[PDB]
């Protein structure tokens, strides 16, 4: 079939891509720059697909084939093609190259591709045996570059276990395997492992256990954008549950900003799900441009009816939505947070009153927030004032909630401080740009 | 100049009959009925009946459909005769003429396909525009969003290659009429105010209504300095404003600062906006918008004004004026903070330095995000 | 012709006279300006409102104290305007850097 | 200086946003007249930033 003929052409091109990866993989090993591998690993997701049984076999029959037990491990785990007419022997290793054991980078990369194919073939156990052996191979392997290729495999290995749906067997493994990186000052591997570990933690709701891990651990600042985006969501999820709302918004909005423009329709879907609920509990009505966007249109529409409820403050409407769309929230892992809101709808209206009125008499606050009595609002009016949702002072001598007299900020020191955080980053960007500058060793 | 096919009057009437309160209107039905029988709109009638559950007149339909069939056959016979005997000029007109009969009969799909075939064979640039304009009217008549935008792109591209001024003037209104219905009011102000002096597309709307739309959209769009020089003192806009006094009162009342009549004149402009087939989905966003400009305009001069004064100036009670400012202030639309204990409203208009500094943070923050977003990428 | 033109006069004679009266003061009860111009407080209440709105003279009408707060408009501090325009400028260059980044 | 640097950014946008690739290495050598790209660029930044930093530090 011409589809497979293009497939083998895709195979050879993927082999050429792999050969490009392996040649670059073998490039970095002798190129003295782990950066090269990152390019091959970013093509990994792209080359992750577009492969069937003939691909790996010819790759493993093209790569490796040193008569090493490696062939004996993944060849049986993947269906072998017949005596195909186009037997393009794709051996980047010729003789001595075959005789030389495959570098830990390419072998895992090829094995990961098998692992990926194992995932692509749903063979998480053969991959399990493949992968842990991969790890059992790379567990001993202590190179500096393999840490990268190991990091990708880890999430896939976490992902193979991810489809295995245990996540506790790897809870310890990923928990210890992490410590191997940190004792190596390795950058990427520590980043990737932590995100997979945390996902493990939230998946069973051990927020207490998770909240600790972020407390002591330090996420490498010079981390992959992809990872930095992930860690920010998980921390945002933890912070939101821990009742540290204000920080939950700052990280989640920052986590969202780091999403890979338009590749991950999902991640943006879930984060917006928490951001909208996270924002509501803090007293801020979320952005409307969200709910109209294409990808998040139907996904967040369930939350849409909510945010309309809070602004309306019609508790009967709010309960009605939880009754209907509430059950769906649980799967999203948000029902609990919404339950907080049901007894927190009064805050925003307290903010709306403080944002527009500046000296509203308490009795008036009760009228405009549906509070039962003028006395009841006082605790709520102060509480919102107490909790820093307002900036007002309740003069109980005559029952009026005065708002703070706003000042000319430009004559105070706020603008200078805002410029400092800005200039420090701007200067740092110059140093980071200049600092690397990667002048290749003049050829 | 261009034909009245399709009649946007029919579309406006049908929307009016769709509205709840006017669903039972009889005068609208006669006019809608009058248009169908006069132009023999058989298929539209079916669509008209199904949407509004009207009863189809079999005798009219059969005579109409037979008339449509015999007329369609006659065009079919003429088309065949032209193909065998005449050149591409006659077949081009024959195909072009054929579609125009689909338009008059309400066949949306059939009209679109027939025209699209013609555009394939049409050669002269002048004729290409006319078919393009023909699709646009179909889109507006049916509110077919995708058609109106696609052809508009065609019109702009076709005109740029070779475009006489007459057609470019026409497209300016056609672009504008769409803009009102997509709630892009500012661009409607630019488009209309550039063609009020030379409105030559009488097909879409009568001249009194084109100026009436311009005053409606001009006020929501232009700031006071631009409104004064381009509308209030505009030659043509005033002249037809002597035949539509109600709009005249509406436009001036905002400029002269007679707010009591402006709100009352806005009630008429809200009711009228409810009936137009174009300003229907946007009437609520409109009456809210002019409301905010009215308040913000008055507060622009007074720092702290007694809410009692504002209610009297606006001819509305103290309670309502307190309420709306509350609802508008919250959405960050009006710069003011209502003091309910003393009923005094104090303005919080930023100083020039404050707003510029605030803009440096916002515009600066957006830029630094990008630099950080990029910086991470290239540095790998 | 005598009404439209003459009315424009009185409506202008009031401005040139309002400015002359307010020239000394820096805060004057809207009640007092009425006495000098010999016009009802409502008439001067409005004409002041439109004059401030139209950028005729730089002031503000506070209603809770019945005073017109005359003041001086400080410049638009060009430096910040050159920065804001520059930010957009550099915002466009950072975009064109992206395209160079795509080449990889 | 901020006004003068602004006009120099306009060219920087035009000079970069052009990015014409008709032998760009030759483009970078056929347009050398001590002009927009950098020389009249941050050269001013150093002057502008040195003058402010010294002035500010003296102020404090």
């Amino acid at each position: 079939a011409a589809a497979e003929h293009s497939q083998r052409e895709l195979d050879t091109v993927t082999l050429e891509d792999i050969k490009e990866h392996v040649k670059q993989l073998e490039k970095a090993v002798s190129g003295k720059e782990p950066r090269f591998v990152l390019r091959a690993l970013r093509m990994l997701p792209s080359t992750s697909r577009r492969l069937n049984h003939y691909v790996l076999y010819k790759a493993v029959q093209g790569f490796f084939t040193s008569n090493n037990a490696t062939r004996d491990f993944l060849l049986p785990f993947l269906e072998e093609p017949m005596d195909t007419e186009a037997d393009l022997q794709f051996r980047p290793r010729t003789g001595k190259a075959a005789s030389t054991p495959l570098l830990p980078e390419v072998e895992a990369y090829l094995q990961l591709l098998v692992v990926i194919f194992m995932m692509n073939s749903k063979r998480y156990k053969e991959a399990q045996k493949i992968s842990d052996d991969l790890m059992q191979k790379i567990s001993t392997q202590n190179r500096r570059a393999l840490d990268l290729v190991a990091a990708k495999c880890y999430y896939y290995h976490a992902r193979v276990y991810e489809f295995l749906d245990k996540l506790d067997v790897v809870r310890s493994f990923l928990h210890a395997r992490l410590r191997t990186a940190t004792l190596r000052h390795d950058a990427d591997g520590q980043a990737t492992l932590l995100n997979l570990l945390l996902r493990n933690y939230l998946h069973y709701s051990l927020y207490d256990q998770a909240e600790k891990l972020v407390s002591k651990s330090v996420f490498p600042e010079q981390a992959n954008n992809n990872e930095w985006a992930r860690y920010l969501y998980y921390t945002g999820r933890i912070k939101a549950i821990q009742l540290e709302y204000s920080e939950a918004r700052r990280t989640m909005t920052n986590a969202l900003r780091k999403a890979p423009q338009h590749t991950a329709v999902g991640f943006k879907q879930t984060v917006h799900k928490l951001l909208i609920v996270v924002e509501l509990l803090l007293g801020e009505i979320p952005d409307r441009l969200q709910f109209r966007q294409p990808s998040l249109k139907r996904s967040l529409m369930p939350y849409f009816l909510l945010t309309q409820a809070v602004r309306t403050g019609n508790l009967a409407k709010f309960n009605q939505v939880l009754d209907q769309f509430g059950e769906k929230f649980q799967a999203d892992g948000t029902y609990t947070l919404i339950i907080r809101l049901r007894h927190n709808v009064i805050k925003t209206g307290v903010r709306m009153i403080s944002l527009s009125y500046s000296r509203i008499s308490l009795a008036d606050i009760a009228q405009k927030l549906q509070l039962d009595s003028p006395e009841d609002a006082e605790f709520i009016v102060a509480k919102a004032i107490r909790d820093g949702v307002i900036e007002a002072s309740i003069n109980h001598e005559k029952g009026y909630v005065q708002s703070k007299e706003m000042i000319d900020i430009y004559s105070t020191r706020e603008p200078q401080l805002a410029f400092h955080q800005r200039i420090s980053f701007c200067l740092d960007i110059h140093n980071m740009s200049v600092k690397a500058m990667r002048f290749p060793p003049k050829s | 100049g261009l034909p009245k096919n399709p009649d946007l009057r029919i579309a406006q009437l049908r929307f009016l009959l769709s509205l709840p309160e006017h669903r039972g209107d009889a005068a609208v039905r006669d006019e809608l009925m009058a248009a169908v029988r006069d132009n023999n709109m058989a298929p539209y009638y079916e669509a008209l009946c199904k949407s509004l559950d009207w009863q189809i007149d079999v005798d009219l339909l059969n005579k109409m459909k037979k008339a449509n069939e015999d007329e369609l056959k006659r065009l079919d016979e003429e088309l065949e005769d032209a193909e065998k005997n005449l050149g591409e000029s006659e077949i081009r007109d024959a195909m072009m003429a054929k579609a125009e009969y689909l338009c008059r009969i309400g066949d949306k799909e059939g009209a679109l396909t027939a025209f699209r075939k013609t555009y394939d064979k049409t050669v002269a640039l002048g004729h290409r525009l006319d078919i393009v304009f023909y699709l646009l009217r179909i889109g507006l008549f049916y509110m077919d969003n995708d058609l109106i935008t696609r052809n508009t792109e065609k019109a702009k591209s076709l005109i740029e290659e070779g475009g006489d001024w007459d057609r470019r003037n026409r497209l300016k209104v056609y672009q504008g009429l769409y803009c009102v219905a997509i709630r892009d009011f500012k661009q409607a102000a630019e488009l209309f105010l550039d063609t009020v002096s030379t409105f030559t597309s009488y097909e879409l709307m009568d001249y009194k209504t084109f100026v009436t739309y311009t005053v409606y959209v001009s006020m929501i769009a232009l700031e006071r300095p631009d409104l004064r020089e381009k509308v209030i003192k505009g030659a043509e806009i005033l002249e037809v404003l002597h035949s539509l006094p109600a709009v005249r009162q509406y436009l001036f009342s905002l400029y002269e600062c007679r707010y009591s009549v402006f709100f009352q004149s806005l009630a008429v402009v809200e009711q009228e906006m409810k009936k137009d087939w174009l300003f229907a989905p946007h009437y609520r966003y409109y009456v809210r918008e002019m409301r905010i400009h009215a308040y913000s305009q008055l507060l622009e001069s007074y720092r702290s004004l007694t809410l009692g004064y504002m209610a009297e100036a606006f001819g509305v009670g103290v309670e309502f004026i307190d309420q709306e400012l509350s609802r508008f202030i919250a959405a960050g639309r009006l710069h003011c903070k209502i003091d309910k204990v003393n009923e005094i409203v104090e303005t919080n208009r930023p100083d020039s330095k404050n707003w510029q500094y605030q803009e440096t943070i916002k515009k600066g923050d957006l830029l630094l995000n990008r630099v950080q977003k990029l910086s991470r990428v290239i540095n790998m | 012709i005598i009404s439209t033109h003459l009315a424009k006069l009185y409506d202008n004679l009031l401005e040139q006279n309002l400015i002359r009266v307010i020239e000394p003061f820096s805060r004057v009860q809207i009640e007092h300006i009425s006495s000098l111009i010999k016009l009802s407080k409502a008439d001067v209440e409005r004409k002041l409102s439109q004059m401030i709105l139209d950028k005729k003279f730089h002031g503000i009408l506070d209603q809770g104290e019945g005073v017109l707060i005359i003041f001086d408009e400080p410049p638009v501090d060009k430096t910040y305007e050159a920065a804001l325009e520059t930010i957009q400028n550099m915002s466009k260059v950072v975009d064109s850097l992206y395209n160079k980044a795509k080449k990889l | 200086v901020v006004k003068e640097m602004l006009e120099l950014a306009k060219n920087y946008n035009k000079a970069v946003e052009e990015e014409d690739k008709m032998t760009p290495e030759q483009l970078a050598i056929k347009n050398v007249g001590k002009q927009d790209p950098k020389r009249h660029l941050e050269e001013h930044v150093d002057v502008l930033m040195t003058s402010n930093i010294v002035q500010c530090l003296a102020a404090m």
Partner: peptide
């Protein structure tokens, strides 16, 4: 701050131009 930003965008542009330079020469070597 405006001085700092200009020096940063110029810095990034110089790394992107350089990243292209060595990379392009990298491929062109083959």
């Amino acid at each position: 701050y405006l001085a700092s930003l200009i020096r940063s965008v110029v810095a990034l542009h110089n790394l992107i131009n350089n990243k292209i330079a060595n990379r392009d020469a990298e491929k062109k070597e083959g």
